[PDB]
Assembly symmetry: C3
Homo-oligomer: 285 residues x 3
Amino acid sequence: ESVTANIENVKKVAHHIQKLTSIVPEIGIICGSGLGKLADGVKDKITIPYTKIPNFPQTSVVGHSGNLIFGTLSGRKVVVMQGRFHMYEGYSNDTVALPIRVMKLLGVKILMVSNAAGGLNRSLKLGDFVILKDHIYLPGLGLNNILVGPNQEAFGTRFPALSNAYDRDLRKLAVQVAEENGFGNLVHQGVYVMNGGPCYETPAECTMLLNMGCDVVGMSTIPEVVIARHCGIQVFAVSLVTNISVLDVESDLKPNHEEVLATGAQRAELMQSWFEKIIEKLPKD
Amino acid sequence: SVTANIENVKKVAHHIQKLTSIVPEIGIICGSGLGKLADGVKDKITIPYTKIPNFPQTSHSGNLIFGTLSGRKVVVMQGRFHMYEGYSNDTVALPIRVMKLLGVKILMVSNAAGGLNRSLKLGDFVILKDHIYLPGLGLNNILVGPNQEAFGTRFPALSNAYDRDLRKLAVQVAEENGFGNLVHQGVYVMNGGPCYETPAECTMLLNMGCDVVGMSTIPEVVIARHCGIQVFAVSLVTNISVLDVEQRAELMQSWFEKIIEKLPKD
Amino acid sequence: VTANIENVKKVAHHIQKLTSIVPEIGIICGSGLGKLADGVKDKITIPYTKIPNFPQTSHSGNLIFGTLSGRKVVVMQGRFHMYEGYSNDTVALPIRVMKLLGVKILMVSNAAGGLNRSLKLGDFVILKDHIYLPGLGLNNILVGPNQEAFGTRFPALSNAYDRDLRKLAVQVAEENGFGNLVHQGVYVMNGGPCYETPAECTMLLNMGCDVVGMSTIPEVVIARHCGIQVFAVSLVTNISVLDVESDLKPNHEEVLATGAQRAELMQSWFEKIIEKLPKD
Ligand SMILES: Nc1[nH]c(=O)[nH]c(=O)c1Br
Ligand SMILES: Nc1[nH]c(=O)[nH]c(=O)c1Br
Ligand SMILES: Nc1[nH]c(=O)[nH]c(=O)c1Br
């Protein structure tokens, strides 16, 4: 489980970070599919490798450590997480939760996140943006909920509600910004379902998930969202449709990570612009 | 914690049998309204979990309460062990297996649940007639691990898990006492928890054929059926699930008491 | 013991010192395949107990090497089901060893409940797809660091049940007079060890599932991950009870009996399939 995401450990990490930077983030951004360039474009940044933060969880992309990036974006103070902790990697609940709880103590009020997802809904097109308006946490309904274990009262309640988990005001703003900027047609809202992974979904699985009312399927994000809502951080989440789910076994169509990465790199520029323009218009401030 | 094997369970049961002469035939786990019941058991002996070696401990320390209720010898279990708290399979199972060794023939369980079925109202009683054990189908079944053969078989059937005869009687008792309009029978689905269910989740669960949702009870029911204890269980509907993002306690304890009065006795 | 390239090579090498047979087909005995090892000619039998670091399972399991239908095979007698408490690495290691040993095709049988209302006791349901409930729910056998010598981080499962093998299996059945017994269907894994409730069966049927069992999928995922072609068949050992009022119920002794009844046929079917596999 590594180090417990309790108030004492989370404070020690926040304080270490606060010695490394004077940027107090209002907005946290977890870089997923399509956000690689956003991460790169933060103004007046300070980059802190995970390896330099005692008790911060460790992750790499082929040996290269993840980073926390502080600075501004559209004139608002941000922390960007470049490097995520996916459960199919075997990370514990505490490992995944600790960074989100650190954001809470640093001052984050709003969390923005992207991911790659397979398009289940038959109206979706490759490269579409699907704003999350709800989710189905399959691991969580099992006994693999990120909050399973003693509750950390300092951060939230034993039985958190997930009613308005995907803040309806942030969703309205995101849609407006897309419409205003000419790409409203690329933007949908939908139900995201988590497959613990790391296998792509079989056609029978995709058919089942579609019939359950799911619009997109992915392997990430929900656990971070749950920790965020648990501690009162407002959440905005987007899936980039990186492949269209195959519903028939007798198809030679096949999911592959290469094409998922490619759709991500191709949409990165537009996704960056969307996020920067949302941020410019975020409520208050 | 300690493996819920026959030796560890025998140890605990044998200890309790030195503290009470009461051989319980009915076991009761009050989840929803109340406690109380326990309200009312006579000639009672109260045993803190903390005074029972190798017994699981709460995280108000729980109690086993022995005595007579509606003329029958009972053990009431006050203080539950839920999987969302992080308890192990063995921890959750041990208390139920201890009941088996003490003489328990019938387990009666109450809980609070969210109403999925759109015909349900706040305060309705939903007798479980079946369940969907999501964690169990997903490789988190309380029986995963070596089978404890002294207690039951490797692949238990869950046919008549919620004894149909006990359900008929419970319905008869409710109807005789004028609250039969509050009683439904339904399928309970376990959400591992501890998050409440999203509207998308609730919609899927309803469409899976589920009537109520909760985070408990099924693990205990599985262990009870595995060792041949008959089960009766009821959900109190304590909220109505939202499907789109866009003193009842006292009636229940009274119902349980009146059922026990009419239970068969060997 | 991690199912990584180092540990798996060590096991494979030990095995290679005990047999010169380089298997091209690996077979996992489940329901109906009890007799299969007996047909194996020029066989050597290697108890799991005699293989350092190979996982161990109860009257010790065996690896049987030899010739079946003119082809080199390794038969696995004794499996590792997740409801017994086995680890991901424990289940995956034997499959990865098969791969290092030269296996190109895995054939597997299992017992399953018949969800599809047209199924009959003793029918054969060739798997053409699956629903891995434990895998959707974060208990996927591949969870953890990906072992790159074996395969990719995100394996696809689109033709997991090799269609061509499926076509041959059906052809063999039809030409041998038991085509009426054979179906193709979707298998759903229940992590187990409980039989499914009536409400659970109804839900699974409505999910598009034809049969339900507690095995096989984890091994299939590992095989596919390392590029082994898979053929898998469920024997319908009991008809799922969907009606909570019903008197019918699954009985494990009847399940065993049904599987054993079909053993001779299942054997013949597998042998005749292997006989017709394209060789070069
Ligand atoms: N990027 C994708 N594509 C897919 O088909 N299923 C998934 O879980 C992810 Br992540
Ligand atoms: N009491 C409730 N209400 C609900 O909507 N969901 C639950 O899991 C429980 Br417990
Ligand atoms: N043999 C069976 N029968 C059934 O109804 N469910 C199962 O999971 C297995 Br294995």
